[PDB]
Amino acid sequence: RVANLKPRISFNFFVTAPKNVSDIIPRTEVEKAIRMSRSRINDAFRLNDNSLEFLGIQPTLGPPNQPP
Amino acid sequence: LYYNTIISWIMWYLFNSFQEPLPWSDCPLNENQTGYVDECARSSPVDYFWYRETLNISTSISDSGSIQWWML
C-alpha cells in the first residue's frame, strides 16, 4: 500500500495480506524481511542504501580483512 | 636522541603506507560487525589511530602502560 507520494521519491508504505485485507502483515517481521534482501533492491535501481533509506533499517555489514 | 624517536615514526607511517584503504582513513568497527568504536565515533579516524595505533596511549605522565614492542 502506497501513501503520501512525494515527487522526492518518498512515501510511507506498508504491506497487507493479499486478500485477507482485514489483516495486515506485522511490521516486526518486515524489518528482518528487508534486511535479508536489502542488497537485492539497491542494484535493482542502481542505488547505494543511502538512497535506500528506511528510517529504522540500516546496513549492519562490512568487516575488512585486507592483511594476510 | 629524541629526534630519532620522531624520525622512527616517519618510517612507521611509511610502513603503514602502500595500500588501497589507508589505515587512518577508516574507523575500526565495534565488536558486533557494525559501526565503530566510541573514540573513533566521537573523533576522526585519523586521531584514533594515533592513541592506539601509532602508540597505545596513557592518561598521565605518571602512569607507564604498554611498551609498544613493534614500535620499539
Query: Mutate which of B33, B37, B53 to test chain A, going by most A C-beta atoms within 10 A?
Result: B33
Burial of B6 (0-12, 13-18, 19+ CB in 10 A): exposed
Residue A39's SS3 state is: helix
Cβ-Cβ contacts under 8 Å for A42 (sequence gap 6 or more): A48, A49, A51, A52
Resolution (A): 4.5
Q: Is A65 on the interface with B (CB under 8 A)?
A: no
The one-letter code for the residue type at B54 is T
Q: Is A60 on the interface with B (CB under 8 A)?
A: yes
Read off the C-alpha cell for B33: 560487525
Let me know: does A16 contact A23? Beta carbons within 8 Å: yes
DSSP code for A16? B
Let me know: does B45 contact B35? Beta carbons within 8 Å: no
Q: Nearest-5° angle of CA A49, CA A51, CA A57?
A: 50
**Residues B18/B20/B24/B25 CA torsion (nearest 10 deg):** 150
Contact B29 A62 (CB under 8 A): yes
Q: Which of B66, B48, B50, B69 is nearest to B58 (CA)?
A: B66
- How was this model experimentally determined? cryo-EM
* Cα four-point dihedral sign B12, B17, B19, B20: positive
Let me know: does A25 contact A15? Beta carbons within 8 Å: yes
**Residues A36/A42/A45/A47 CA torsion (nearest 10 deg):** 170
Cβ-Cβ contacts under 8 Å for B27 (sequence gap 6 or more): B36, B37, B40, B41, B45, B48
